[PDB]
Write an enzyme that holds these catalytic residues in place. Structure first.
Site, mmCIF file in Angstrom:
data_model
loop_
_atom_site.group_PDB
_atom_site.id
_atom_site.type_symbol
_atom_site.label_atom_id
_atom_site.label_comp_id
_atom_site.label_asym_id
_atom_site.label_seq_id
_atom_site.Cartn_x
_atom_site.Cartn_y
_atom_site.Cartn_z
ATOM 1 N N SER A 175 -24.588 -128.603 124.337
ATOM 2 C CA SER A 175 -25.729 -128.226 125.180
ATOM 3 C C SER A 175 -25.986 -126.724 125.366
ATOM 4 O O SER A 175 -27.011 -126.366 125.920
ATOM 5 C CB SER A 175 -25.649 -128.907 126.548
ATOM 6 O OG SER A 175 -26.212 -130.211 126.452
ATOM 7 N N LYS B 194 -29.431 -125.398 124.581
ATOM 8 C CA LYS B 194 -30.596 -125.556 125.459
ATOM 9 C C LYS B 194 -31.183 -124.243 125.997
ATOM 10 O O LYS B 194 -32.370 -124.181 126.352
ATOM 11 C CB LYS B 194 -30.284 -126.522 126.607
ATOM 12 C CG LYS B 194 -30.321 -127.943 126.143
ATOM 13 C CD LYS B 194 -29.606 -128.869 127.058
ATOM 14 C CE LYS B 194 -29.451 -130.222 126.374
ATOM 15 N NZ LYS B 194 -28.549 -131.176 127.055
ATOM 16 N N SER C 281 -28.701 -130.125 132.409
ATOM 17 C CA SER C 281 -28.370 -130.492 131.038
ATOM 18 C C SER C 281 -28.974 -131.860 130.707
ATOM 19 O O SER C 281 -28.455 -132.608 129.891
ATOM 20 C CB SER C 281 -26.853 -130.479 130.825
ATOM 21 O OG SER C 281 -26.544 -130.084 129.486
ATOM 22 N N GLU D 264 -30.704 -134.790 120.591
ATOM 23 C CA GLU D 264 -29.757 -135.375 121.528
ATOM 24 C C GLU D 264 -29.788 -136.882 121.327
ATOM 25 O O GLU D 264 -30.870 -137.445 121.295
ATOM 26 C CB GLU D 264 -30.129 -135.048 122.975
ATOM 27 C CG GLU D 264 -29.897 -133.593 123.379
ATOM 28 C CD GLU D 264 -28.415 -133.230 123.552
ATOM 29 O OE1 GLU D 264 -27.541 -134.035 123.172
ATOM 30 O OE2 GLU D 264 -28.112 -132.142 124.091
ATOM 31 N N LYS E 174 -24.611 -121.588 131.015
ATOM 32 C CA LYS E 174 -24.961 -122.889 130.501
ATOM 33 C C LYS E 174 -23.715 -123.458 129.825
ATOM 34 O O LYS E 174 -23.071 -122.789 129.023
ATOM 35 C CB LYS E 174 -26.106 -122.803 129.493
ATOM 36 C CG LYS E 174 -26.439 -124.180 128.839
ATOM 37 C CD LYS E 174 -27.316 -125.037 129.814
ATOM 38 C CE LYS E 174 -27.395 -126.525 129.433
ATOM 39 N NZ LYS E 174 -26.071 -127.189 129.698
ATOM 40 N N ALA F 93 -20.526 -129.860 126.207
ATOM 41 C CA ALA F 93 -19.382 -130.706 125.899
ATOM 42 C C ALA F 93 -19.780 -131.583 124.754
ATOM 43 O O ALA F 93 -20.951 -131.909 124.596
ATOM 44 C CB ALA F 93 -19.012 -131.567 127.076
#
Length: 263
Positions: free
Chosen positions: A45, A48, A105, A141, A209, A212
């Protein structure tokens, strides 16, 4: 009491029996602390922040509007969409989706914004156009968190990430207002408590930010500094470990404590 940062990283890597990458980059001087700086890690993530950077560039150019509303379906939801699943009926603005993607997230939010900039290849083109030839996004995602060893998809290096964040957050690519807007969403991060935030002295600025992923992957990108102002960029990635999650948090926190002690 911690050893010097680089030594702490070696020890953390050993304890995790995995792979750790780090760059600390000083905004004013250009001084760097680095470890595995040129090896690839999965972004998870952390990508992002880049995604939202590209959205804001389009806002600056008049092609996107922050108050534009996007409607989506229950079909469009992927796993971990805590904000976007609450607004199925009314939809969300571009601005709301950026905040969700960064502060929570939210995965579906990320995928929605990705679609507006041309998908993964769209983000990768934007990156190439701003001078990053390393970082790449290939999937959506949540497939992009798979983190297979040796697979170069959805990876960056700590050096390239730090350089790109420096350009986006402190450079001239985005307008002054857009730069501030991006940092503001990062400051408001709601899911990074157990990491750098857990070892940060009072009065310190942080904007971060987290990521995982599979194969024991964890990461964090951060702008931080004493006395309420950002002064350095920190990028930490770790992968290829069987450690528990909050064991991965603890090792990142430990590296953070060494970084702050030997600031």
């Amino acid at each position: 009491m911690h050893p010097q940062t680089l030594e702490q990283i070696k020890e953390s890597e050993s304890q995790l029996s995995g792979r750790v990458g780090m760059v600390e980059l000083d905004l004013a001087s250009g001084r760097t602390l680095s470890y595995r700086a040129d090896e690839r890690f999965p972004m998870m993530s952390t990508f992002k922040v880049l995604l939202c950077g590209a959205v804001l560039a389009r806002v600056d150019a008049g092609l996107e509007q922050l108050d534009r509303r996007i409607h989506y379906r229950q079909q469009d939801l992927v796993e971990y969409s805590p904000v976007t699943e609450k607004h199925l009926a009314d939809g969300m603005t571009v601005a709301e989706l950026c905040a969700a993607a960064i502060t929570m997230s939210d995965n579906t939010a990320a995928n929605l914004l990705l679609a507006t900039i041309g998908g993964p290849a769209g983000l990768t083109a934007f990156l190439r156009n701003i001078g990053d030839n390393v970082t790449r996004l290939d999937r959506w995602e949540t497939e992009l968190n798979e983190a297979l060893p040796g697979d170069e998809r959805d990876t960056t290096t700590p050096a390239a990430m730090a350089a790109t964040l420096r350009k986006l957050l402190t450079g001239e690519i985005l307008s002054a207002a857009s730069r501030q807007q991006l940092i503001t969403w990062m400051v408001a991060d709601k899911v990074a408590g157990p990491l750098l935030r857990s070892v940060l002295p009072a009065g310190w600025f942080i904007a971060d930010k987290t990521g995982a992923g599979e194969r024991g992957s964890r990461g964090i990108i951060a702008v931080l500094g004493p006395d309420g102002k950002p002064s350095r960029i920190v990028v930490i990635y770790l992968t290829e470990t069987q450690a528990s999650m909050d064991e991965r948090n603890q090792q990142i926190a430990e590296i953070g404590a060494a970084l702050i002690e030997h600031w």
